[PDB]
């Protein structure tokens with residue numbers, strides 16, 4: 001239903017309130033995903049197809065030649081195969097002292113790092129912060145999302161699955 | 167011959183309506199373009215138009231008027247479109263933030279069920295007063311007037327100098343619990359007033375205790391800010407009009423319709439009481455009309471030059487909310503429950519540059535009707551321009567043909583702006599705007615009713631915009647109303663409700679009567695004595711103001727009332743006293759018993775908690791004098807076939823991609839009992855009633871029409 005430029009504004013954080021309320025209060029537009037993902041595609045500097053957005057600067061992607069599925073930054077860096085935790089192949093900054101917590105919180109409003117830690121996760125090439133965790137000491141890294149990509153495209157969207165190698 | 171006694175007025179964004187009532191109830195109605203920069207000019211013109219139908223001069227009539235009621239829309243519009251004044255605020259230091267925090271509430275005020283829970287829907291509007299025009303004084307007064315932190319007067323002098331320097335255009339002062347002890351807030355006000363004198367600037371000051379001395383500081387401050395923000399521009403208007411009229415020989419003081427449906431004096435400095443005066447005019451006329459004809463459940467629908475106003479009259483009464491919200495603002499003044507959407511005959515038709523979708527309004531053209539009027543200088547097309555293209559309006563009968571409306575201007579400006587950017591004909595360009603509006607108004611009216619828990623078939627729909635009879639078919643089609651009525655005087659319907667308004671004065675005094683359940687009959691008579699006194703103190707106030715208006719005490723009918731509650735509560739109930747006099751023990755038992763009774767009805771018999779004891783919180787006194795109310799016609803009904811005299815030819819009328827030659831009828835030349843099959847337009851001097859093909863109307867003995875689906 002929605003105008004294409006209006007779903008762009010929504011991505012750019014610039015959409016008007018009337019259409020923002022319209023989008024929220026009425027049944028969703030079945031066409032959203034295919035318009036959305038195409039909007040993201042034309043904003044990448046690499047022509048490999050996008051399969052699913054993982055964050056603002058993070059995607060599951062289909063290699064134009066090998067047809068493998070991978071996690072990719074917007075800049076270009078492939079982290080891992082899509083069934084793996086990308087964070088395992090990323091770089092991490094751990095805020096575990098009052099000095100580091102007091103860089104992003106005023107004292108007293110910072111968590112205490114013997115109870116809670118800030119783990120920031122960056123792309124190796126561009127330094128982009130794709131995710132920040134707030135667990136305890138010892139706590140494993142978290143595999144956020146394992147999507148059923150086949151069922152989504154095939155059963156919920158009525159679309160062929162993109163070609164896939166291993 | 168004829169003695170003209172009552173005058174009602176709707177000063178609107180487009181037309182200023184006048185409603186004259188004579189001694190026997192007979193009436194006549196005048197229309198004129200508003201002169202919003204000095205509404206006296208349009209008032210005079212409309213008066214002379216209405217009075218000329220009675221072959222009477224404005225001079226001769228004004229000497230005979232005994233009362234008049236003004237209502238309007240200029241202030242309400244200013245609020246809604248946030249076009250008020252650059253106003254600033256001084257509150258208690260350390261709490262400057264409370265205005266802009268909106269008490270959290272105002273991020274979901276007036277939300278339908280579904281959006282109240284849909285969290286991502288909540289949204290804050292801009293604050294009336296931004297943070298850089300707020301300042302704080304160091305003072306603190308507790309819930310019973312004690313000055314815990316005395317006012318450090320220096321901080322008040324810097325507060326004033328700051329906002330004077332910021333070139334604030336009015337300054338509002340709201341200090342906590344000032345309603346209880348206004349000493350500190352009035353010292354601040356005096357200190358501010360002092361600093362504006364030294365500056366040479368013209369900046370008016372508003373102490374909240376001087377205007378709205380009531381608890382809940384977000385409500386009080388919003389309401390007081392309204393006096394600075396929106397009221398001040400139209401403050402000139404009621405003294406310009408009243409001066410122009412006493413100059414001209416009136417012997418009465420004007421009254422104004424106020425938010426609770428009652429009239430107040432034009433002199434009151436609390437103009438915010440009179441903010442929804444125009445719409446409430448319509449609701450009151452529909453209420454009156456219902457009472458004469460036994461319609462107890464009425465849905466009111468008004469379409470003006472700018473918006474579409476809608477309220478429900480449920481079992482003879484309107485609903486009045488105590489601490490209401492309006493335009494997503496908490497307020498301290500009692501309000502009649504209404505609703506609207508911002509579309510009307512002059513709302514501007516624009517296309518989103520990127521979507522190329524039609525957006526109606528929210529602004530309007532007003533007394534300038536649109537492009538169709540050559541001299542209006544209006545370049546953007548308005549819904550009124552689509553009326554001309556489609557054959558809804560008669561080019562040569564706007565205001566009886568006193569106003570030149572050119573259809574080809576409407577056609578060229580519709581083509582260039584709408585039709586050609588959309589690859590449509592001017593016919594389909596205009597018809598799609600009207601069709602969208604028809605559905606938009608219809609879905610709103612259906613939903614306000616659904617929301618309040620009612621079916622549209624439980625109600626009769628009164629329709630009376632002045633431009634609403636142009637879309638009665640539209641927003642009513644298939645809703646299932648019991649009946650849909652277009653009264654013949656639809657165009658001045660609010661000014662009709664204003665001339666119909668009771669001549670009533672009300673007076674209040676608060677109180678501190680605390681009674682346990684078990685009390686001896688001496689504490690019981692003491693309590694009845696002090697309430698008995700307050701009624702007498704109030705009774706002399708009602709009668710003293712009626713004397714200054716030329717009414718002896720014999721003509722005043724008096725109705726005492728009081729406010730009661732269980733002891734520890736926060737809200738109270740108004741109760742009409744069964745006894746005019748109190749005094750003696752058992753009577754205090756009657757007053758409590760009466761309270762209990764209404765508490766059961768208002769809530770539930772098992773809500774009653776007598777063991778908490780009672781608290782009498784105020785006393786009330788009403789004062790009615792008789793007034794000629796407008797007399798509803800009771801004509802003898804005749805044949806269904808209308809006279810050949812009423813036929814005025816045809817116009818090319820375009821609706822569902824079809825052109826038809828729609829009959830034209832002179833409204834006044836129609837007789838009780840006639841029927842009109844669509845397609846036809848019914849025209850008089852200033853009302854156009856549209857009956858498309860697929861509809862039908864008939865006229866009754868009360869000059870009411872009835873829309874049928876058919």
Ligand SMILES: [Zn+2]
Pocket residue numbers: 073074075076077123124125126127128
């Ligand atoms: Zn990267």
